[PDB]
Amino acid sequence: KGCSLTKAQRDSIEVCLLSICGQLRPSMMQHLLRRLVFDVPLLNEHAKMPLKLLTNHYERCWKYYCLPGGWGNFGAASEEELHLSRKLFWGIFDALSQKKYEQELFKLALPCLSAVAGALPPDYMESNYVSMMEKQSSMDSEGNFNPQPVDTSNITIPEKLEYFINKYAEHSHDKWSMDKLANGWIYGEIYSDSSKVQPLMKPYKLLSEKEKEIYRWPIKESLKTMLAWGWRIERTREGDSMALYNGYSPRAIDMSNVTLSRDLHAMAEMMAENYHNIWAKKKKMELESKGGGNHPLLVPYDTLTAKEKAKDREKAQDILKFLQINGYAVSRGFKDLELDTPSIEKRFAYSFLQQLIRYVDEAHQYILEFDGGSRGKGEHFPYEQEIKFFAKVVLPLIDQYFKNHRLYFLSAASRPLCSGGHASNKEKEMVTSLFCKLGVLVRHRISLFGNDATSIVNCLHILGQTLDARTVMKTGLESVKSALRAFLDNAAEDLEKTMENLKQGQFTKGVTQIINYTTVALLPMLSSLFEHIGQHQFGEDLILEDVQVSCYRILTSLYALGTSKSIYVERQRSALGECLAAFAGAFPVAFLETHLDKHNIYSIYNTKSSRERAALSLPTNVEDVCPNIPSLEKLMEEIVELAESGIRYTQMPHVMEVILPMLCSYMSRWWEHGPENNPERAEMCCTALNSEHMNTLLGNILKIIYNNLGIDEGAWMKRLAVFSQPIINKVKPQLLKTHFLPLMEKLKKKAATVVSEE
Amino acid sequence: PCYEAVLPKEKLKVEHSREYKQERTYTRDLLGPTVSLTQAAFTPIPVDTSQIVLPPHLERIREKLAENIHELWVMNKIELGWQYGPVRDDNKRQHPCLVEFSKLPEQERNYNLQMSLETLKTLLALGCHVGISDEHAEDKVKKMKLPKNYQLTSGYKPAPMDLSFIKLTPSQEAMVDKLAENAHNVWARDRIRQGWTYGIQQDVKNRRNPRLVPYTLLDDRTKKSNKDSLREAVRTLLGYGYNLEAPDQDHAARAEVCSGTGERFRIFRAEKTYAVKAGRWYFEFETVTAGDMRVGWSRPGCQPDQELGSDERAFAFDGFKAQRWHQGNEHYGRSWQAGDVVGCMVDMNEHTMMFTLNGEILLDDSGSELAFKDFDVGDGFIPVCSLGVAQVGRMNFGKDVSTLKYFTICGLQEGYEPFAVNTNRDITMWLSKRLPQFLQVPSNHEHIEVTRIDGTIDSSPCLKVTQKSFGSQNSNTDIMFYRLSMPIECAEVFSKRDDYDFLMQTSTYYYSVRIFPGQEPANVWVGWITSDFHQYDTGFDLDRVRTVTVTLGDEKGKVHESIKRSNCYMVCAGESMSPGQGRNNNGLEIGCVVDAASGLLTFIANGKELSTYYQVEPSTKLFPAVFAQATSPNVFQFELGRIKNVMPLSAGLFKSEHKNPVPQCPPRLHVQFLSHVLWSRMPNQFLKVDVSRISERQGWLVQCLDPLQFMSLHIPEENRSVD
Ligand SMILES: Nc1ncnc2c1ncn2[C@@H]1O[C@H](COP(=O)(O)OP(=O)(O)OP(=O)(O)O)[C@@H](O)[C@H]1O
């Protein structure tokens, strides 16, 4: 923090400090954190080193502070540093939000925020009782040394403590009997350092009360400071043992054998710090009276070394042990006032995403008034640093937070992260509302984004992985429910308008921006939603009512995409195909199975009553609502005929590459939803697709690739192989033997190609 | 009769008292520590509710709850076809409950009034927050079908509302079950207050009830009666609109810690002589249950008290957490289930080791198949297994190759050999000893250190006990048990300057123990113990010592002789000391005086004769012992001194010094301490005992007809014998 150093000197001190702290044992750095706590938010020139130290040591202790056990050898968190670190995160975040955008400083501080947010347990209960009476010596604005103690003149010692006072003054007179004997002084008329003649041989009982008061005054001040801190003192029967029991040589007493407890040790550490603060006040008055100079011990007590700590430590020890021997029971300063643990609001993630959704809604309304004023000539941003801070810190902050807490956000104490630490139902509701806000923030603003639209699509991807449908439905605020419904409906409508403008714009300005927005954000994020929902099994139950007709619309649009053919469609075809495969898994109806669609009672087409058939606008048939989609057996006739065809990947690629991921993503889930895989309602259940039929489809695809080798093939069938190792695993190993093993030897012939064959 | 003590579900058998019986080696079910059987003592514990006061809402609706419970009687007795009358006799079918609470006995009316009050109060103490929803839910009442059969005689119509549209949340139903359990506990407690005790049959003369059982063991019929009554009551309370927002499902972690005594795991291993230094070896571990089990290979220096794989002696595999253990724990393999068979393999030449689960090779976090990458041959490896609480396992050394289940699919091709592939005899199996024994304090002990102070011209020889753990963490704040290695023999028959003739004819011996200042005296006990003392409790008290009073009487029944036997004859220093906390300045020399000719144990403390005295039985072997919980680095010290007219301890202990008044401390005498680090040998063969029920007429027959004998090596000094 000193400024007289050269640039090279600053570099050397920074490297040395970051190394020592880097290999330093994690628990020991608590005092250094709490000294850094108030200096970090300044964000001065000196602050880059605190930011880097914060980043590196928190990234090192990513496991430690999150795990309730931490690292077993290094223990776990104390929650005092956790309360300090939440203040760190909030101070840094709010300061950076309100103060001017510097590119270097805020790309350096962003990883610091990420590390702090990750290390802080999202499940953490902000206790109503937190660290208080904050030691202010480190809170001096300059030189972090203002050693004012807690004033205690107002309080007064009570009457039962007078016997304690007499006994402890007896102990003091005894240890100075030993002190005078040790340095050599003996009884005489008057006190003399010359001949070691020294008249205090007389007992405590008859000692003069003035000379007794010389012993009181330190004892009196110590007891007053003890009482002002609030420590409850309780009286035991060992004390009246003394009363029933009731010059001289104070005869050998044995101090050292007794020992204290750890809570009393922290208690005594703070009392010793208080005594050092009183000593440092006295030294400050004497130094100001002097007018100049410095003292080696002028540094705060935490900055001190053990040798000077020894005097305070021992003199606190002695009074404490004599207090046990006297029988008093010292406790903490004040009882707990209340517990904020019942409320899920005090959960750290809850407040974090609280101010996060306020900031996100603020950014969304700022971009709304920018859509309004962007037709004006002035393109300047009054909220420039607001939105740049948002997009390049908050959005990365959200991304890193949800990545670090993959399982936490999925955790509802219902076995996801069964160790504990569940994201609350309201927290997951407000996660879904954050997803909705991100979507409505990203609708048709790619050009307005300064290429950070890729960051935003990754944000939407991550928020798509972080979802919990059961929790949202069984417990969900109606506003958030409507937000998600309007989300899905608006996404479907956006795709329907892009489908209609692509039929009318079959031949291939603002329409280019719209289609690029679609293919870069909307299709990938819907695909991510679809992948997450299907993989995490909540597809069927996220899809109950009118969300089914929304997904029917999305299916019609997606199949129109699959049947649409252009050069830009070919360029963005991989995203299209992955969207197709994702939605097939998400979609709950065997829409291919034209004959066996209707009978499933689990569908809207069965729950649809009759009055609200007529209320809605429906083609009245599961096939008339989707006229273009073909019947499953007809597509499988198509698949077999393309087996005997073996069409080329550069001659006839469209149908043959669009349909294969479709069917694979279908049967991957509707095999285990097939008639043999569901023993209940067999051949009457959702589907009829079976192991022999998919095995024929395997041999079929692997027969087309045989002809496809002539044109050196393409990567998307390697993507199919990626899709199909799950297929190979979930197919019975008996079908592997004698059919798929000859396929391994046939593909052993195919090993001539440079590409890696499975 | 003793058959009346059988719990209703279990059937009476006659088993072996000990766990292990005579059977095949590979079928022998190795057993871990058993769960403590605390359910035998069914103490009905009620949740305390007297401290809680009714909130104002419940206070103003108390009258409506009284009306509701009156409606409950007048529906229950009328829904069962029952009618009304003064005496509650079931044969004439008369009950006053169908009539108004006024004619109904006010005492039972109020009894049910407040037991419904503490019903809602137990809901409150359980976190059930019974508050009114709205005044609608009280102003509206539905009307039930009230035929003549369902008709009542009181004005309180039993037609509040049909409970079909009212649903009780699943957690609320579970708490209803809990409160029904609480009501059953209240009933059982009242019966205990009257003195009722459980019996399989029902009696009123002996006044015994089979209904006096925990709710889990209660019969389904009474379960359903109480269930329907209390569920209907809570449902009607909800119908009154006082909705109760159910307290959360607070998940409970039983922590599986209920083992009898401090034993957490039982370690089984083969004999140290079968250690392997070379070759490929294989053996199978069959898991009867799934839980805290570890199997692997251990060195001959494995400690029976430490858990396998915590330190270097053992290389074990824990599938419960799916972790390999050697000086630590790293993720390895998967978790097994009940019936899964683990196959352990070792290569002593390639220095590799790996495991199998039902045949497949377990994989590390990396793709490598080696459980432990490399190690040193050292002194060889031996098969080992540790079993947790309520765990059953089987170890097959492969003496019969056919008995190995997965050896053919894995292990045979690789060239691994069964551990007992070429053995004519079964492998002797050693286990961790349950019962602690006294042994000499090791010089390398991490907490206890003993120094021997030679006797000077003015000081008697002393043995000083110190703790090196103090002043540092890991210091064990547990009561250590100490004793001297050599006993005093009391006379075979009991008779019915100090003088150098009295001192030569006397048989009274003395040792003293000085408690060092700063060591808390009430934490230290001094006296004598016998060879039978095998009790290791973290908390020790003189009231807990094992005692028995054998009384032998003449032919009428007069007690002509009473003998009290105990293994511990010791006193506390805190009670012996008079000045209390004002002392601890110096001293506290407790003196123990033993009269070998009369068996009188007298204790002196700071020159005064203590009140406590013990009279022992002839030929008792007494070991000088001191039990202390160390609160100071220096805790107590044996002083082998003497007082006036009292023989020294060495004279009693040794025979060559029988007439030597000078105190001595020969090297044989040394401090011994109680510990659990000892192995026990399972016998190769057990007695052939068969047990069966001959008939109801004849009972259970047990029969042993084969004689087995074993050599017992008797250590003379310690008065114990081992095989
Ligand atoms: N109709 C009723 N039948 C039984 N008990 C009733 C009835 N009405 C009120 N009670 C009350 O419930 C109590 C329980 O009576 P119950 O016939 O169940 O006896 P018990 O306690 O199970 O008997 P035991 O201890 O002899 O097995 C009675 O003592 C009485 O206070």
Swiss-Prot record, chain B:
It is found in: Sarcoplasmic reticulum membrane. Detected in heart muscle (at protein level). Heart muscle, brain (cerebellum and hippocampus) and placenta. Channel activity is modulated by phosphorylation. Phosphorylation is increased in failing heart, leading to calcium leaks and increased cytoplasmic Ca(2+) levels. Residues 205-402, 497-645 form the B30.2/SPRY domain. Signal peptide: none annotated. Induction: By TGFB1. Sequence repeats lie at residues 33-146, 147-260. Belongs to the ryanodine receptor (TC 1.A.3.1) family. RYR2 subfamily. Homotetramer. Can also form heterotetramers with RYR1 and RYR3. Interacts with FKBP1A and FKBP1B; these interactions may stabilize the channel in its closed state and prevent Ca(2+) leaks. Interacts with CALM and S100A1; these interactions regulate channel activity. Identified in a complex composed of RYR2, FKBP1B, PKA catalytic subunit, PRKAR2A, AKAP6, and the protein phosphatases PP2A and PP1. Interacts directly with FKBP1B, PKA, PP1 and PP2A. Interacts with SELENON. In cardiac muscles, identified in a complex, composed of FSD2, CMYA5 and RYR2. Cytosolic calcium-activated calcium channel that mediates the release of Ca(2+) from the sarcoplasmic reticulum into the cytosol and thereby plays a key role in triggering cardiac muscle contraction. Aberrant channel activation can lead to cardiac arrhythmia. In cardiac myocytes, calcium release is triggered by increased Ca(2+) cytosolic levels due to activation of the L-type calcium channel CACNA1C. The calcium channel activity is modulated by formation of heterotetramers with RYR3. Required for cellular calcium ion homeostasis. Required for embryonic heart development. The calcium release channel activity resides in the C-terminal region while the remaining part of the protein resides in the cytoplasm. It is linked to Ventricular tachycardia, catecholaminergic polymorphic, 1, with or without atrial dysfunction and/or dilated cardiomyopathy: An arrhythmogenic disorder characterized by stress-induced, bidirectional ventricular tachycardia that may degenerate into cardiac arrest and cause sudden death. Patients present with recurrent syncope, seizures, or sudden death after physical activity or emotional stress. CPVT1 inheritance is autosomal dominant. This is Ryanodine receptor 2. The chain holds residues 821 to 1640 of 4967 of the full protein.
